[PDB]
Design a protein around this nucleic acid. Sequence first.
RNA 1: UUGAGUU
RNA 2: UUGAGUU
RNA 3: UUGAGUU
RNA 4: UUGAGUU
RNA 5: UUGAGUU
RNA 6: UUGAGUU
Lengths: 147, 147, 147, 147, 147, 147
Amino acid sequence: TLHKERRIGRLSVLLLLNEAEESTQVEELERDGWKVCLGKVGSMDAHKVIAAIETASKKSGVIQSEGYRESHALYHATMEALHGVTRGEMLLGSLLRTVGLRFAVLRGNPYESEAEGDWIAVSLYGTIGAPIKGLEHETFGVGINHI
Amino acid sequence: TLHKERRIGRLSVLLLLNEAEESTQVEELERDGWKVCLGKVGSMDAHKVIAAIETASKKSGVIQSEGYRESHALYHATMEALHGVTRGEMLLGSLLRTVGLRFAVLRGNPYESEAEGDWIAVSLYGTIGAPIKGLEHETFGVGINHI
Amino acid sequence: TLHKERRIGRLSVLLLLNEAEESTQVEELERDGWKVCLGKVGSMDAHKVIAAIETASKKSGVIQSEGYRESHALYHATMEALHGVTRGEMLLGSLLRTVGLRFAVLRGNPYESEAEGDWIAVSLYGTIGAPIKGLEHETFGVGINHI
Amino acid sequence: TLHKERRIGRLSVLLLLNEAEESTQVEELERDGWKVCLGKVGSMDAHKVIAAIETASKKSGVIQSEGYRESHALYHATMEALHGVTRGEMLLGSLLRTVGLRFAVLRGNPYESEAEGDWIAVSLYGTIGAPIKGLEHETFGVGINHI
Amino acid sequence: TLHKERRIGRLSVLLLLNEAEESTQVEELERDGWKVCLGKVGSMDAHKVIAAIETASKKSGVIQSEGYRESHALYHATMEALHGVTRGEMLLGSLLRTVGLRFAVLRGNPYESEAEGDWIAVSLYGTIGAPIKGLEHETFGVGINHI
Amino acid sequence: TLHKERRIGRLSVLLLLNEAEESTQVEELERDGWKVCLGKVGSMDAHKVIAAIETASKKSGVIQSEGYRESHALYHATMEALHGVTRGEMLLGSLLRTVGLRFAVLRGNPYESEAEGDWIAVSLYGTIGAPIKGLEHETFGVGINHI
RNA sequence: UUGAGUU
RNA sequence: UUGAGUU
RNA sequence: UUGAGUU
RNA sequence: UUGAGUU
RNA sequence: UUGAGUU
RNA sequence: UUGAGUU
Ligand SMILES: N[C@@H](Cc1c[nH]c[nH+]1)C(=O)O
Ligand SMILES: N[C@@H](Cc1c[nH]c[nH+]1)C(=O)O
Ligand SMILES: N[C@@H](Cc1c[nH]c[nH+]1)C(=O)O
Ligand SMILES: N[C@@H](Cc1c[nH]c[nH+]1)C(=O)O
Ligand SMILES: N[C@@H](Cc1c[nH]c[nH+]1)C(=O)O
Ligand SMILES: N[C@@H](Cc1c[nH]c[nH+]1)C(=O)O
Ligand SMILES: [Mg+2]
Ligand SMILES: [Mg+2]
Ligand SMILES: [Mg+2]
Ligand SMILES: [Mg+2]
Ligand SMILES: [Mg+2]
Ligand SMILES: [Mg+2]
């Protein structure tokens, strides 16, 4: 059962979709026990998007830098989020398109039961389009996994 | 070029994620010239999700009830939104999973140039999981198309 | 090397797109040594499309009715043709859409070298759309396989 | 309801699958109000195929060179046509295969009702195979979208 | 780093492919600390395959019957295994095909580092084909996930 | 009907999953009439995996070096095997992952009826992961086709 | 169309 | 890793 | 959950 | 073709 | 197998 | 954009 006040997906998205000069939403989430990471990446190569998210998550301490387990969890969460962004073919430059994204990675337990342990949510928001400024529209993606 | 104050995707998602009893965001969006539709649907059949969105959009006047053009635009926008929700296989019951969703459909011009005409965004948010209450996690999907 | 006068794909499509009452293209193709089958099928169930094509092919003698080999070749050729028709998700009714198709199955050697043996082409043409007459557009699909 | 004499998909394919030294089929379609573009492109990179179609369509006046709306419509129509060509994975060189294609882009209203506005069809025909002349078979793809 | 003597994938597959009446490989694996489950299921409905695997895994104690975490891990491992079996479209009956499978689910730590925790492997082996005995060929699938 | 003693899929996998210094399993299969090829390939480019399998199969005489028919059969069998390895997106480096594989290609008739002719099985086993030694897990894939 | 559900 | 780009 | 099936 | 690799 | 259909 | 190519 998901705890209404701990909906990791909704929280990650609301954080990513805000632009307040000083909302202190990060410190607030962290005070509540969440591990948070925010970043931005633009590219015509999906691997660069994946790497940016991984590197930011490890530097911010959202997931362990050592071992495979947590990296495995984050990779699959990122893949799931990329599905929403790419919608069918997980390709960018090869299909003549580019993305400009902001991302958020949140880690914690969104359930009422503490036995559910930690989960991770990767949320993406930005634009996708032809490699010409302006010829683009918005894109979103959210991936959730246990960790 | 997307107009900062008219980002259809971001606006549709923000509307979907708010539970304010008396927010009046719908009237505000409509005042700004947007055509808006909000609804909810849960099912183990993707076709029921698609139908709920189409029916709600036509009843609320977001898209024309007659003709094919606008229905065609809405169908593909819905398909794109479903990619984020299903992440790989656009199947629910056949893969032993069910979804409970809230949706928003927004229609208007998000660009600086009026020549870009109307576009439509279909946003979905809820939970996806096994057919047992509680064995689920959040899911999101956003599809954008010209109309 | 494909023989210019024996392009199985192009020939199957041309046969499918002609509505000439008394064309006699079938007899002409058969005179050239091709095994040909023409049919029609409409449905919201992909399996009914596959079955119609298989049954027609076996009844007309385009592929052997006994054994698995030729049925295996035809099944995969049909799957490839369905990709062009469905474009992403090989689903019809489950995604609230229906198809009305005409199909042609051609069998023979399209290469200059006789050692290439027989190949088979499955071509589909018709309309796909919402379950309401008129809310539809054209669809095409061609699958080619060795047999 | 599709107008029998204005079936954009069938017309685009019949144009592409003809090789008459002088059929004047282009001028005929244009006389009937259709905007037409014909071209050819070969590559192991899908983005080069997409770009060739876009550039030819804009140079021939089939779609507006300015703005995003029409480019958006053409991109998705091209993606749909590529599904028929690639059948599963929208990849060429990465999967050790190459394509040699001829393409046609047709724009106009294929419906009886003028309210349906303009639609666009992208049709592809050629060969796909290993990067060795002769080790190939035919391939086809048709994508249709509103514009 | 995977431990040579604890390769969960290889071990699960070897267990699945052995028909030795009195092999006692299950007891041996359990002696080594692995949690093991073996079963069989045939169907034209993918959801029945998923359900059989889940039910067998929970009854045999390979994964916890309560909570979502472990069920979530098993579901995704099963999905990955199904990719190898279905190869493109995770559909059986809808594409006029049926499967007869034997499955094995193994749980334990395959790495040298104990900090990697438990992982789970779902392996499938059997036949897939038309709904007519004999018109079929073999199929395999292996999915691995952290748990 | 598949012959119990000639299950091409199971045989190819058991061969690949063995590491005996001298099992003479190759000569045994060859004595039984099977054409066999064993190899290994690691890469972040799927095309290199495909090429390694093709080249080894042609050098070992498992398939004809001349003509297209047999190369066509092997290519599609390899594609099917890659589905089990990639599980969703047939991409490696582009999705920031690499594979280290051993492969086996077996050719012969696995059915009781000699009329079924030759079939081919491509089996893959190894590891897939991030481009960092140790951050990986096992992967498997089996593709079967008529030839 | 007005948020689904058990193997 | 500190929001991409022209066929 | 204890290996499916006809167009 | 004679088992890949760091963001 | 002899061209489908309403949320 | 004016039909690609070898492991
Ligand atoms: N509209 C495309 C992006 C794009 C490529 N070229 C133009 N637009 C998408 O939905 O991903
Ligand atoms: N976790 C699945 C849903 C599910 C099915 N069973 C359990 N959970 C998903 O990501 O869609
Ligand atoms: N336009 C859809 C079919 C459809 C469903 N609903 C309306 N139209 C397609 O391209 O397949
Ligand atoms: N036959 C492959 C193309 C190919 C690659 N290598 C040999 N042939 C296809 O259907 O796309
Ligand atoms: N050959 C198909 C199964 C099948 C359906 N009909 C005949 N055979 C596969 O590879 O899945
Ligand atoms: N775990 C991924 C591979 C990977 C990439 N990065 C880390 N691991 C898979 O299943 O393919
Ligand atoms: Mg993995
Ligand atoms: Mg459409
Ligand atoms: Mg098969
Ligand atoms: Mg788009
Ligand atoms: Mg999940
Ligand atoms: Mg082929």
